[PDB]
Amino acid sequence: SRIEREQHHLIESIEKSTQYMAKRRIGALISVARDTGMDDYIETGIPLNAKISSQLLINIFIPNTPLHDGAVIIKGNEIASAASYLPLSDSPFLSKELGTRHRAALGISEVTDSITIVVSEETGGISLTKGGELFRDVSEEELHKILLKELVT
Numbered sequence: 001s002r003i004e005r006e007q008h009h010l011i012e013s014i015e016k017s018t019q020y021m022a023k024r025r026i027g028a029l030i031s032v033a034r035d036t037g038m039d040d041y042i043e044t045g046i047p048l049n050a051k052i053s054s055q056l057l058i059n060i061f062i063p064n065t066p067l068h069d070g071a072v073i074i075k076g077n078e079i080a081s082a083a084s085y086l087p088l089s090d091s092p093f094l095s096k097e098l099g100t101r102h103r104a105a106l107g108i109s110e111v112t113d114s115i116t117i118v119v120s121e122e123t124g125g126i127s128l129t130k131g132g133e134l135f136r137d138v139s140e141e142e143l144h145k146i147l148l149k150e151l152v153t
């Protein structure tokens with residue numbers, strides 16, 4: 001179909017699912033592939049090759065469920081995999097109060113041009129990684145403008 005419609009639907013799906021999980025302190029880790037490949041990391045997860053929806057993203061990350069423990073990787077117009085491994089950053093600049101999801105999101109951002117979104121299960125804050133930088137606890141307006149700029153081409 002039309003690319004721009006899928007991209008805006010992707011953005012709305014992330015905004016809606018992360019708002020839902022943030023409110024309930026459900027951790028999440030969602031990495032959006034771009035030009036650089038996430039293919040090897042997709043292979044580490046459970047293959048879904050599913051249509052993107054906020055409902056599916058929420059169901060994946062329910063705690064103590066088969067699909068929740070690891071990253072979701074979106075590729076093109078599909079949720080490609082759940083429970084994928086991402087490389088963990090060894091950076092000592094990452095705050096010690098952040099968890100493995102953040103360290104994983106930082107690590108993939110150091111070696112891909114992917115955009116990765118984290119929901120902390122400790123605080124509910126939403127964070128974002130790109131190019132080896134972390135944007136910690138962004139507002140809904142900040143998240144919206146970042147995703148517009150980064151995911152709509």
Ligand SMILES: Cc1cncnc1N
Binds near residue numbers: 070071086101104
């Ligand atoms: C430990 C871990 C958790 N989630 C994603 N990647 C990882 N390496």
Ligand SMILES: [Cl-]
Binds near residue numbers: 027120
């Ligand atoms: Cl967390």
